[PDB]
Amino acid sequence: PKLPRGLRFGADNEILNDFQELWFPDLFIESSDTHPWYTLKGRVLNAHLDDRLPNVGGRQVRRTPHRVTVPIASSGLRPVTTVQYDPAALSFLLNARVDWDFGNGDSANLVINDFLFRTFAPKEFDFSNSLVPRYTQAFSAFNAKYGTMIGEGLETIKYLGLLLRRLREGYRAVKRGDLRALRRVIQSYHNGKWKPATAGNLWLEFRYGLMPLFYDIRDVMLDWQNRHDKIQRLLRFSVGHGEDYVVEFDNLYPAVAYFKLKGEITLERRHRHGISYANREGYAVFDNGSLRPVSDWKELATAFINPHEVAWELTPYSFVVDWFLNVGDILAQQGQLYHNIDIVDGFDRRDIRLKSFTIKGERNGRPVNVSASLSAVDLFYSRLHTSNLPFATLDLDTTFSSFKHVLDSIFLLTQRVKR
C-alpha cells in the first residue's frame, strides 16, 4: 500500500520489485468509451444533416494495472513487465468524405467524423517454431562475434590489476619510509638509468614522480569502462519475426441505410522474444539504496593527475587510502555483474499493427467514391513473462568466472592496503 502496486519491501526495509505482481498481475475488464459519437456534416439527397448520434454500443477489454520497477543490477537493467490488452473487437476511426453524383436528381456530399467500427481480432497465433531456431546460431556465432572484445577486456582488467599492484608497492614503500628504495617503480617507466641530483622526499617522489603510471591507469581504466559498457549491453538477445494478415470488416451504415461501405484492412502481426542474463543470486534482492555512481570511476582516475589537490599537504595517507578503498568498492560492485549469469528474465510479446487498407462503396452500380484515411484506436498487444525456455540456452557463467575471479583478487589486493 505504501509502495506503488508493483513494489514490495525486503528484509531490511529496502525497495524491491514485487515479482508476484510483475509477472502474475491481476487482470481486469474495462469498457471505457473513447469516441461513442459520430458527426455527419454536409447534404445528402437534398437534405442537410448535422446530427450527433452515438456509435459505440458495448466495449470489453482485459488489461493489467499500472506498475513500477527498479533496476536489479549495477548496469541499470530493469525487469520486464507483464501487460495485456486483448480487445474483443478492433477499432478504427474513419474520417471519410462520402460523396457521389447520381442521375435523375441524386447527389450526396458530406464528411464523417468520429465514426468507428468493430471487427474480429485474430488472437490465436504462435510463431514459436519460427523464433526458437533463431537463438542457437546466434549463440554459436556470439563467441566468434565478440570473443575478441571479451578477450581484450579480460586482458585489460588484468592489466589494471597489475597497475594497482605496482601502485600498492609504491605506497607500501612510502608507508615504511625510504627515499632510495621508493624508486623501485620509478625505474619501471623512465626506460633509463635516472640518477639523483639532491636529497628528495617521500611524498615528493610519489605525488607526481609516477606520472606515466597515473596516465596509464587513467587510460586503461577508461578503456575498461568503455568495453564494460558494451559487454553488459551484450547480455541481451531480442529477436522477432513479422508477417502480414489482411482482414475484412462487416458491413456498416453511417447513414440510415443510405449507402454501404466495404473494403479491406491490412495489418501485420509480429511475434517477438527477448532473453536476458544477469546474476542468479542477488537479482531478487538488489540493494538500490547503497551503490556508488559511475562518475567517481573517472574521478579517481583523474585525481592523481589533477594539479589541484590540497590533501597532499594535509593528509596524503588518508586521501590515497580512500582512493584505494573506493576503487575496490566500485570493483566489487561491478563484480556482481558476472556472478552466476543465467536466464533470469524472459518475455514473449505478440502485437498487431496496421499498415494499409482499402475502401469500396457499393449500393447501386458502384456509385460511391471514397478518398479517406484510416487510423486505429485499439490494437492487440499481449506481453507475458515466461520462465520455461524449451531449448539449449547460452549459459555465460563459465566464460565470466574468470572476470569474477580477477575482480575479487583485485578487491582483496586493494582492501589489503592499510593506513
Binding site: K2, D12, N13, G289, S290, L291, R292
Partner: protein
Amino acid sequence: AKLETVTLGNIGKDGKQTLVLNPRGVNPTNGVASLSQAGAVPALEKRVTVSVSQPSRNRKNYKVQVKIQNPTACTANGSCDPSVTRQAYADVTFSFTQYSTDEERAFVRTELAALLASPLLIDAIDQLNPAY
C-alpha cells in the same frame, strides 16, 4: 502518505482553534508536498511543507523535513488588503540510516510530539524563557 485535507483539531494556547490545510500539490523539482489553509491571498495563509530525501550517494542518510509558516495579518484601517508584518517559522528535520527501524522512527516522532506539549518547551517557546 497521499495528500489530502489535513484538519488539526484543538491547537493554541487555550486549545480551542482548529486548522484546515487544503491539498495544494507536490513541487516535483524538489519532491515537496505542500498544504495550505483555505483562503485567497497567497501572502496571508498558514502553510506547511513535507519532504522526503532518500540517501544520496554523497549523503547515505534518510531525511524528513517538515516546515510550517504562519504570517500575520496586521490589516490596516483601509487603504488596501492587509500586509505581511510578521512570519512565524517552524522547521523539523528527522534523520536516520538505511537499516533504520520503523519502531525507533515512531519512537522519535512521539518523543518530540510529547516534548512539544511538556511544560518545559511550553514556556521555552511560549514565554521565550531560557531553559533554566
